[PDB]
Amino acid sequence: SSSEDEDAGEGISVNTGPKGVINDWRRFKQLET
Amino acid sequence: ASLSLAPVNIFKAGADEERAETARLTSFIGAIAIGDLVKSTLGPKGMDKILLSSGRDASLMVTNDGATILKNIGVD
Ligand SMILES: Nc1ncnc2c1ncn2[C@@H]1O[C@H](COP(=O)(O)OP(=O)(O)O)[C@@H](O)[C@H]1O
What we know:
Chain A: Belongs to the phosducin family. Chain A: It comes from Homo sapiens. This is part of a larger assembly, with chains A and B. Chain A is mostly helical. Chain A has one helix and no strands. Chain B is α+β, with helices and mostly antiparallel strands. Chain B contains two helices and two strands. The chains are: A mainly alpha, B alpha+beta. Residues 42-44, 46, 66 of chain B line the site of adenosine-5'-diphosphate (ADP).
């Protein structure tokens, strides 16, 4: 009833680029030092 | 199975090794790069290099000598 459970080229040797960028390199290097 | 490409790791942190192809490639690249750099300073029409030191002194050298060029470079 209702009731239920529901309920390559590695060697580079960069030539001139370091010379070109040395200005910024030293700019950062002074503050880092 | 090589030391590098094995399931267990046998090296310190930072230690590595290059097998046949890699070792030969590294050696050939380094040698050819050194030879290409030192050349063009060879013979009567060879030109000189500029050795710009990156140290505190920042020494400047102009040379055509192969040994002088080769000794003043940081090669790994
Ligand atoms: N006047 C010249 N005519 C032809 N070849 C030359 C002359 N002078 C030098 N050479 C050649 O240039 C070669 C390289 O010499 P050089 O460029 O001084 O560097 P390195 O002597 O250090 O190898 C030598 O093997 C030599 O035979």
